[PDB]
Amino acid sequence: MDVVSRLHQKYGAEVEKALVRYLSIGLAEDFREAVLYQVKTGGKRLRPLLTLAAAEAVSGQWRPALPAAAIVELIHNYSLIYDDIIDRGDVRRGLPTVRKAFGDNAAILVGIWYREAIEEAVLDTPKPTLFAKEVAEVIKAIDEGERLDILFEAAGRSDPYFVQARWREVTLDDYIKMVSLKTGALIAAAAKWGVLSVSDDRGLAEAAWNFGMAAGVAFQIIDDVLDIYGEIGKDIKEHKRGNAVVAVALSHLGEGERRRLLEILAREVVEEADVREAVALLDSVGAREEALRLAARYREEAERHLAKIPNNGTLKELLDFIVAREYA
């Protein structure tokens, strides 16, 4: 009876109903399958589960936060629809992506639809003008985080902007800022929005936001370690300097080792032997362990903020899962 299974049982059916409800407003019958596709392919629903748990911890009630929970999961899926176009992703959750099944241009029409469904959910919250502003701010954060992650790549893009605006250097501080935007902001919002749905306590909302942000950063760092040590070397093959282990290593490596790691990342096609060489360079400065220590720092930060939230037992279990506490 892990926490995600337990909360899926408790909240899952109402979350799915809410997603379909807002997407379905005004939806033409011959567009229905294409539009609902992205929310019918499965997914862990961690973000809306967090929203509802946060609302329940602070108020005893979760149902009032269903509109907010739909907002956060629809934003997640909006971002995925476009990310699949941008990265030409064929498969997600073990099934074809929207762009694969329907076409890239059809997926654009679907993505556009998702954002107006998000607005319908905003208008259904207890505080519509507040949520409207927070949604605009969070989507701009995600868009900016994605822009940065792409400009932190060393190769592999054909868009003139992505090549010409590529960053010359990517520091650890740059990496942390990028992941806070790309991954942290929406987890922060998931928690904060659960509180805002049921409470006017500004301190509690802010503690929730800070908890979710730190949790999201820890999650992303752990994911980055997995995306190096494993498919071994995934992020290396994808030329990413925006990877916690890579960013950590580039900060410690000597002149020629640093230069060599960057040479490998910039290879137009990264070979298996290049991957092992890059990993050896990362290991030569203990970058994997440094990354895990950084994740621990953010996990502990998340705990400090979470201690400010009452009746937080379920939130604590979620945290352990979101940040893959056990794995690390």
Question: Annotated binding site for Mg(2+): which residue ranges?
Answer: 83, 87, 146, 223, 227
Residues 96-115 that bind its own copies (CB under 8 A): 101-106, 108-109, 112-113, 115
Determine the residue type at 67: P
**In the block, residue with structure tokens 């203990």:** 286
61 binds, among its own copies, Cl ion, none (CB under 5 to 8 A by kind): Cl ion
Report the nearest approach of Cl ion to the CB of residue 305 (Å): 24
Using the rule CB under 5 A, give the single segment among 59-67, 71-79, 269-277, 292-300 that binds Cl ion.
59-67
Instruction: Give yes or no for residue 63 binding Cl ion (CB under 5 A).
Output: yes
**Can you say which residues are annotated as belonging to the binding site?**
83, 87, 146, 223, 227
Distances (CA, A) of 237 to 10, 65, 156, 158, 248: 40, 41, 9, 16, 18
Instruction: Give yes or no for residue 159 binding its own copies (CB under 8 A).
Output: yes
63 binds, among Cl ion, its own copies, none (CB under 5 to 8 A by kind): Cl ion
For the record, the structure tokens of 255 come out as 């002149």
Out of 4, 8, 16, 31, the only residue in the binding site for its own copies (CB under 8 A) is: 31
Report the nearest approach of its own copies to the CB of residue 164 (Å): 9
- Residues 53, 47: Cα–Cα separation, whole Å: 10
User: In the 8-state DSSP scheme, what is residue 27?
Assistant: -
Cα dihedral 81→179→203→76 (10° resolution): 10
Out of 11, 82, 209, 219, the only residue in the binding site for its own copies (CB under 8 A) is: 82
Nearest-CA neighbor of 311 among 56, 61, 57?
Answer: 57
- In this complex, which beta carbon is closest to its own copies, that of residue 115 or of residue 260? 115
With residue 172 as reference, give the H or E element that holds it.
helix 172-179
Give the number of C-alpha atoms closer than 13 A to the C-alpha of residue 118, restricted to the C-beta side: 23
- Beta-carbon contacts of 69 under 8 Å, excluding residues fewer than 6 positions away, are 11, 15, 18, 47, 48, 49, 51, 52, 193, 194
Out of 24, 61, 105, 311, the only residue in the binding site for Cl ion (CB under 5 A) is: 61
Using the rule CB under 5 A, give the single segment among 4-12, 58-66, 124-132, 156-164 that binds Cl ion.
58-66
- Residues 155, 169: Cα–Cα separation, whole Å: 13
Report the nearest approach of Cl ion to the CB of residue 62 (Å): 5
Chain positions contacting its own copies, by CB under 8 A: 26, 28, 30-31, 34, 82, 85-86, 101-106, 108-109, 112-113, 115-116, 119-120, 122-123, 128-129, 132-133, 135-137, 139-140, 143-144, 146-147, 150-151, 157-162, 165
